[PDB]
Design a protein around this ligand. Structure first.
Ligand SMILES: [K+]
Ligand SMILES: [K+]
Ligand SMILES: [K+]
Ligand SMILES: [Mn+2]
Ligand SMILES: [Mn+2]
Ligand SMILES: [Mn+2]
Lengths: 519, 519, 519
């Protein structure tokens, strides 16, 4: 029984490829899919965080939908402390990106009575009066419910449905009002405090970038975050408004547009070009459009991102049950596998690691499945189709990338070492899905950090000062990579490896490729 | 925006196909994936069952892992009552298969103290003594645990792991014994009563067909079940032992081997040939082998079954969360979609409909997703690869099937009407995955019933007596199908439809195909 | 209107590719298909030869089926004189290979009366007596015909057919004899002197390597020919007998087995492995087997050679009519195009350049068509299928080759510069059919010369002494290539180019590849 599902790799057709998957075919050590973990109570701890890093964490997500700047400021402080605790050995140090998740134009209810279980009980068929009067802002009963969206009455006529708390509870507007709405509970349940509200099929006129959002964004720039996950991007315009706030200083912060509404899906393409990467926000998306259609959008978005060479993230409830159990459900297990198979650059945990009882177990599980799923990819067809997809381009780096991935498949290289400062060279190699890991060695820390956004890139930060002789500085970097790999168990002395470097210091792209043995 | 994801159907590549999926492309009314619902407390009711049928139920699963013959006898009685309640109109009557799920060579614990919450609490690190003494059979403490597997000590040495309750709780044998084992709780939790036990990597010497199993099987034959889902089939031999018990009388009961252990996966092929269909028992499978590998086995088994033309079922925890909530999680939604996309003939609910609070909602959800996912298939490539896969065969019915599916894709037929008595003709048409529904009209009830096992076949039972003139009897049957379709909303007058019939009464296969308009 | 038929290159299917061919899409300057010209009266002249070289000649074929060693000795002398006349400028000097074509186990008639038009007239239905008596060796009438095959009577029974002069004339053995045969003229015609004779379906017992052949072979070694086109190779054994005569000295002379009989086709594979390259000797082949089947053998042999990475030649009557006219027939035009499209490494002229009235025009015509046809190839599918074909191999140079060709397609490189001494590296790159020209720079002259055998390789001989510093010696060679290309009009300053070099002097293969701009 070969390994890395290679027997299936040799398949002519998909059905064949599929038929040849072997549960006894061991995957390699490198896990190419990036793992984004949302930090919170269950993971705030520096010690916990250190354990997260060791378990596979690559990006720490700060969800500004809750918490105060003071809060996140410390969260970020801890992840950095945790990260740098390994900063010792440059060979074992693993960069960890910091991402700020916008609390975009979203609707939420107020606080519940308090002594009513902090959770009322809407009965299937009961009447519920929605109010905009800030008085009941923190006193929500089974009859009174306050929400922060003031113009709610300016866009919802009688009959329309208003969902609350991850669409689990639905309400039908029975009667309109000036600053209130009386509705009928359709889906019963126990309403929580300050839960999310969805107005599917409704021109919600909240601003792409709210006032709070501008503050949060500025905050992120000052706190040097590596990327922004912009919530509810519904058009290229929104992305631009966001990029603007980040301004000249936040200039290098990668913007990841989140697709969570029907318009965003409908106007995906312009949003894609305007953005640096995309996130399939399955959560709100599953409420704004029929749940049974979310998979369509996912595969379409991942597909189109893969084609465009832009990072894409699959997010929300992937390992949901693990918030309370140490093992995920069969559906959750397959969900992760398929996202990787779909082509997602990164998978995410949020809740499973933010406030669940098994943050570490959840991270480990994603790491395990990804590896397993990655080997299961149909690399040959993938590469071929990816190639046809971009045939109109004749970019030199692209050519280098494709030539390298090709070569790597052919001699089954142990890895591809790419020396890059902007990261472009490595991104490009990742675009064409090699099977082996891509060790990108850079002296730029933010590059190393943002690199996680790309499938297969395993960043390494060279901390040695530039050597006088270019040739030497290159060997220096290449050797660092050779060690990281040997240490990380990616390959041992003797294995073959592809190496991409520049021609002169500060080259435009890695124009040089060579097959080399591991020292 | 076309429908049935047809724009994507026109794709040249997968990435393209993927990129073209449209959430606004409406699927057709017919849902080709069979839905198997496990019956229990939450669904025992004849009235509930009638509602299940209307919601999409196609096969009622009786799980003999629990309950008494008296119990199941009544369950079966009710589903039949519920079914026949529609027996009135032959146009609206929907056949419903009865399946018996074996309680194979499985290990279970005994009953818990009772006043201890009927659930003890094993603490992470605590010591737990496993006992075989039938005295504690119904008195299991946090220190005493009884299990029904007597030879457990004859196959588990010190150090080995023993999982309990869907592998959520793990234990490590610290010390051996004659009829007992002292272990250390690794994964804490609240042990329930009579929970399943897994000895991954352990030659469990329980018999393929136990003594109780022989009784249950005989019972099923006398109760005229349509199929048997044989648990823990680990080799072709086991299937044969099973087929034997069913004997001459149970001769036509389709045997569905369940793959739940590592050996069954490893010896899949012989098991496949020996069996009529297969079930991917994700539950035990996810405990016997690493969870992160279950997807590999699923796709491999579905792939190989599709190739072999034998029915395959995807089962366990697909819509798990719906046991308590009215809406499934994003992962569960995608899990179902992917199983359909994987090629599974049938999807299953067990727990979601056996004892959960939303049996109907769960059935409806599967029905919705399947439709959605079915349109999303890459039919062209699928058909092509399926064809290459079986090119060595030159079977006449196969040729007819392929010719028909081909024709159907080309003129976008509304459906394929197949007159069959054994069902072979329709099975064969289903083998080559047409996009449209396959209306199989038969006078044989058990055929109609078992037909659900196949993707796309929508059985119709002709209850009119055989007509004197073959030509007439054919039009009779064809017209019935034409009505069912018109009634069920599959097509209206004018639409095109492919019709496969025999040449003489009692033909070997439907050798005649013709494009006809809907009257 | 793009160029190089690139719009068609982008095609998904063949029908598409085909449909997109554009007569207004200009091909590039480099002509990848090697052109082999048979030298004779019409081309013996050093001045004519110089003109041949300028017109495209790459290999000069010496046909030992006629002429004396003294003759060929001078022919070879002249081609060399002609070649070296350009030896001046190493940038414009074009290597020209010398090939010796064996006069294998072939049958020929004697001389005709003389005053009978040096051509008798066999009438359809007349009787003709074949004789082995050396007396009529130079006195052949319409009744008497002598042939050099002594054992002709030991393998041809009454009824069998004996063809004469390119099968244009057929005869049926009416009666047997001891040293004679009386036959009936079936196909009338004007018999010439010393014409070829074919005994299709007859165990002709002539030796693979005749006595004269051993002399001719030894002669070729002493005259340092680059390759031997071995006539009538009917099995691997024959090739070996040939390689043996060439012995230790002729050790590096490439042996090209000629497939001209039914056995050679039937035992092709062993012949292929035993040989260095193959020649589709359409001439005799079209007489030994039905003419209407020759195309089958051609495509099969070219196909299998392409797959094996061994040079294949398409030969005989490609531009036949041009022996007397300045323009070829429509069929001849397409014949050449298709041979190139078939995948033939080299096309040949023999007669068109040996004794026709338009040697130069014929060479120019092949050159024109090849270019045109080369652009018309379906490179993408070709590369993909070529890759699948050899997937079992994991050769490092192969990987480099494939990676490079891939890269070259992607950025539409102007050419691939390969520094090689044995030629292996360049051969390998040619194996995977890049679209651009392959400039192989070598210091080995015989390598440069034999390189023509491979599609796309444009040899360049570095005549500068090895430089002290490897790095320098490499740039030296690379720069030479850069100049040849600029001079030859293959590319100008700025264009992109792929460069393959070794890692240390005398490397095993070019393990280094880099995209570089033309200085
Ligand atoms: K948020
Ligand atoms: K069972
Ligand atoms: K010859
Ligand atoms: Mn959101
Ligand atoms: Mn089971
Ligand atoms: Mn010949």
């Amino acid at each position: 029984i070969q390994t890395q599902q290679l027997h299936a790799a040799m398949a002519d057709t998909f059905l064949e490829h599929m038929c040849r998957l072997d549960i006894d075919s061991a995957p390699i050590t490198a896990r190419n899919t990036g793992i984004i973990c949302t930090i919170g109570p269950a993971s705030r701890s520096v010690e916990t965080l250190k354990e997260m890093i060791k378990s596979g964490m690559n990006v720490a997500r700060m969800n500004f939908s809750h918490g105060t700047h003071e809060y996140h400021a410390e969260t970020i402080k801890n992840v950095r402390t945790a990260t740098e605790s390994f900063a010792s050995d440059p060979i074992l140090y693993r960069p960890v990106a910091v991402a700020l998740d916008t609390k975009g134009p979203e609707i939420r209810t107020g606080l519940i009575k308090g002594s009513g279980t902090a959770e009322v009980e809407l009965k299937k068929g009961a009447t519920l009066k929605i109010t905009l009067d800030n008085a009941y802002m923190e006193k929500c009963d089974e009859n009174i419910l306050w929400l922060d969206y003031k113009n709610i009455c300016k866009v919802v006529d009688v009959g329309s449905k208003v969902y609350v708390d991850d669409g689990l509870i639905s309400l039908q507007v029975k009667q309109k009002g000036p600053d209130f709405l009386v509705t009928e509970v359709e889906n019963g349940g126990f309403l929580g405090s300050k839960k999310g509200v969805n107005l599917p099929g409704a021109a919600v006129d909240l601003p792409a970038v709210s006032e709070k959002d501008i503050q949060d964004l500025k905050f992120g720039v000052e706190q040097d975050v590596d990327m922004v996950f912009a919530s509810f991007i519904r058009k290229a315009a929104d992305v631009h408004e966001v990029r603007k706030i980040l301004g000249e200083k936040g200039k290098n912060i990668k913007i990841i547009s989140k697709i969570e509404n029907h318009e965003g899906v409908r106007r995906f393409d312009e949003i894609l070009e305007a953005s640096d990467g995309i996130m399939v926000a399955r959560g709100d998306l599953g409420i704004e459009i029929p749940a049974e259609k979310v998979f369509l959008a996912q595969k379409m978005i991942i597909g189109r991102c893969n084609r465009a060479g832009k990072p894409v993230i699959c997010a929300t409830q992937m390992l949901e049950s693990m918030i309370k159990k140490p093992r995920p459900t069969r559906a959750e297990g397959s969900d992760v596998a398929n996202a990787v198979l779909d082509g997602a650059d990164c998978i995410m945990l949020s809740g499973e690691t933010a406030k669940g009882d098994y943050p570490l177990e959840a991270v480990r599980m994603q790491h395990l499945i990804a590896r397993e799923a990655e080997a299961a990819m149909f690399h040959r067809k993938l590469f071929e189709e990816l190639a046809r997809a971009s045939s109109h381009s004749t970019d030199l780096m692209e050519a280098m990338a494709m030539g390298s991935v090709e070569a790597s498949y052919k001699c089954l290289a142990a890895a591809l070492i790419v020396l890059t400062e902007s990261g472009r060279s490595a991104h490009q190699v990742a675009r064409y899905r090699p099977r082996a890991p891509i060790i990108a060695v850079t002296r730029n820390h933010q590059t190393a950090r943002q690199a996680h956004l790309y499938r297969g890139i395993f960043p390494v930060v060279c901390k040695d000062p530039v050597q006088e002789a270019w040739a030497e500085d290159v060997d220096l970097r290449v050797n660092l990579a050779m060690n990281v790999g040997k240490a990380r168990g990616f390959f041992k002395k003797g294995d073959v490896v592809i190496v991409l470097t520049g021609w002169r210091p500060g080259s435009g792209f890695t124009n040089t490729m060579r097959v080399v043995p591991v020292p």
